[PDB]
Amino acid sequence: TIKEMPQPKTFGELKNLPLLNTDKPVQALMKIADELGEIFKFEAPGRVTRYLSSQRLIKEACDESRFDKNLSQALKFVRDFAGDGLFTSWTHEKNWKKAHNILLPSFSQQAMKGYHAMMVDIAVQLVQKWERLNADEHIEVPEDMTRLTLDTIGLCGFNYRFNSFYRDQPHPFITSMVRALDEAMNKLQRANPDDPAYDENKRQFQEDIKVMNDLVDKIIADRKASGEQSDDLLTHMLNGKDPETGEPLDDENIRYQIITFLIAGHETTSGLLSFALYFLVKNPHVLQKAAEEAARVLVDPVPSYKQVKQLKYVGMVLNEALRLWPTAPAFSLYAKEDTVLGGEYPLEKGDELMVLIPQLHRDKTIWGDDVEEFRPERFENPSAIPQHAFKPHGNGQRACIGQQFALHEATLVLGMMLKHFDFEDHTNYELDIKETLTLKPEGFVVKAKSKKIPL
Numbered sequence: 233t234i235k236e237m238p239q240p241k242t243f244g245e246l247k248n249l250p251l252l253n254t255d256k257p258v259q260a261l262m263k264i265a266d267e268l269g270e271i272f273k274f275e276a277p278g279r280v281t282r283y284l285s286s287q288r289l290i291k292e293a294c295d296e297s298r299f300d301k302n303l304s305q306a307l308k309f310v311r312d313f314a315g316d317g318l319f320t321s322w323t324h325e326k327n328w329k330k331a332h333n334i335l336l337p338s339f340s341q342q343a344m345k346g347y348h349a350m351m352v353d354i355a356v357q358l359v360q361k362w363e364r365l366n367a368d369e370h371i372e373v374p375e376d377m378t379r380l381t382l383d384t385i386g387l388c389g390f391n392y393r394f395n396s397f398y399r400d401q402p403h404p405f406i407t408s409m410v411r412a413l414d415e416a417m418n419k420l421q422r423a424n425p426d427d428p429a430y431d432e433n434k435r436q437f438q439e440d441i442k443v444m445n446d447l448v449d450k451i452i453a454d455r456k457a458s459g460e461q462s463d464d465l466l467t468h469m470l471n472g473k474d475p476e477t478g479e480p481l482d483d484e485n486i487r488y489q490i491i492t493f494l495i496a497g498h499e500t501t502s503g504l505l506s507f508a509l510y511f512l513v514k515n516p517h518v519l520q521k522a523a524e525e526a527a528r529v530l531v532d533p534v535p536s537y538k539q540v541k542q543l544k545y546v547g548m549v550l551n552e553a554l555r556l557w558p559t560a561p562a563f564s565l566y567a568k569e570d571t572v573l574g575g576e577y578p579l580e581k582g583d584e585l586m587v588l589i590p591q592l593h594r595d596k597t598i599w600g601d602d603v604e605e606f607r608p609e610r611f612e613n614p615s616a617i618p619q620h621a622f623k624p625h626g627n628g629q630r631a632c633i634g635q636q637f638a639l640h641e642a643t644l645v646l647g648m649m650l651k652h653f654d655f656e657d658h659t660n661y662e663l664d665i666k667e668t669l670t671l672k673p674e675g676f677v678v679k680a681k682s683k684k685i686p687l
């Protein structure tokens with residue numbers, strides 16, 4: 233039963249490349265999936281991939297004996313500054329498993345307990361900013377979520393204070409990061425990226441990579457000159473030994489990991505919190521239930537590690553926000569050997585797949601007719617959810633190493649937000665999703681009314 237898979241419209245020798253000539257390429261691809269179904273071929277000059285959107289097919293793609301992580305074009309471009317750090321290394325590069333072994337302990341239960349106080353430090357700064365707004369001032373949500381999440385990974389991970397809440401403009405790191413991600417996204421559709429027309433793009437890209445590396449150098453210099461004793465992510469990077477190869481990370485790889493963790497360790501968590509607050513103000517019944525939990529659990533001025541673990545409904549809110557808008561919205565795979573997908577689509581060794589996560593998460597055969605509805609209760613029983621229906625953290629040994637960090641931070645912060653404020657969608661905000669490879673609301677604003685509960 234070998235089927236022929238559909239393909240969206242082509243542009244002569246450019247094949248499908250011009251379909252990416254948009255500021256919202258993931259959302260365009262979602263619309264193509266709407267039209268063509270669970271699988272479609274997508275070609276560019278010298279490259280073919282296949283976009284998967286159904287749990288039926290993605291559950292086979294998640295078989296690690298058959299498929300391994302692939303670097304999408306996006307990740308090949310990001311590798312220009314993230315190197316063979318964990319996010320952009322191939323599974324078979326020595327430095328992937330070596331850094332995985334060395335850094336996995338930085339996300340253990342013990343490590344998360346050790347991060348908790350510094351997470352609260354930043355969370356309290358967010359709450360204080362909002363308590364100090366004047367009447368009818370509003371909150372710029374993605375902007376403040378980025379302040380929070382960048383500062384949290386900087387402090388917990390590296391004992392470095394970006395002091396984002398002391399700035400009315402983004403930290404220089406954020407400015408250059410966003411511009412670098414923008415460039416990587418825009419470069420996806422460039423048929424002739426070496427045309428001199430993109431000389432300025434190349435210069436600006438290089439300049440943004442230098443800004444990011446300059447900050448890395450300071451983080452490293454400050455640590456090695458410090459007299460204080462840290463036991464954080466940077467400590468493991470500088471001192472941890474791979475049980476297997478016996479070696480620590482070398483200096484070049486450490487720099488890549490710092491860049492990787494500064495970016496991966498906050499950008500998608502800012503998106504998550506922004507989407508979560510959006511869905512909460514758009515669903516006041518859900519907001520109330522989550523606020524009720526926050527009030528019952530967060531009985532002290534400062535939340536404790538144990539209390540955040542009891543914010544179980546807030547946890548389902550965040551999972552439901554990751555279902556509708558997973559902020560790292562795709563990952564890529566290649567076939568390890570010849571194999572047949574779904575009994576219908578033969579693949580040769582090396583053939584590429586793209587997993588289109590927001591479309592997977594809209595599979596009506598999994599979630600039912602009400603798929604566009606925000607209902608955190610869908611997550612009450614993970615055993616009732618079919619395998620590989622829900623993949624916001626990737627797959628297998630290449631799944632997100634920072635998942636627990638992200639969810640603890642987001643649960644803590646959303647819990648405090650709901651404990652301390654009522655929220656008003658005073659503009660009846662129309663969801664507008666900005667793409668920077670990752671996804672985040674743009675222009676989302678709210679008003680907060682303080683419950684006047686002291687910290």
Ligand code: HEM
Binds near residue numbers: 319562
């Ligand atoms: C809600 C927030 C987050 C989401 C949605 C997310 C999602 C993902 C996804 C989908 C992947 C797989 C990428 C691929 O297969 O190509 C990934 C990998 C990764 N994430 Fe996360 N992530 C989040 C937060 C974090 C945080 C906070 C950190 C660091 C503290 C982190 C560190 C990483 C790393 C290092 C990898 C590469 C892992 C490896 O292959 O060894 N992520 N993440």
Ligand SMILES: CCCCCCCN1CCC[C@H]1C(=O)N[C@@H](Cc1ccccc1)C(=O)O
Binds near residue numbers: 280305307586
């Ligand atoms: C950084 C964490 C999020 C990463 C998400 C990446 C996911 N892309 C983000 C923007 C769109 C989406 C994607 O479909 N990209 C493909 C595009 C592509 C396919 C075939 C030929 C040429 C180019 C790719 O990059 O290969």
Ligand SMILES: C=Cc1ccccc1
Binds near residue numbers: 314319320492669670
């Ligand atoms: C380099 C890794 C990365 C991870 C998330 C967003 C942008 C970049």
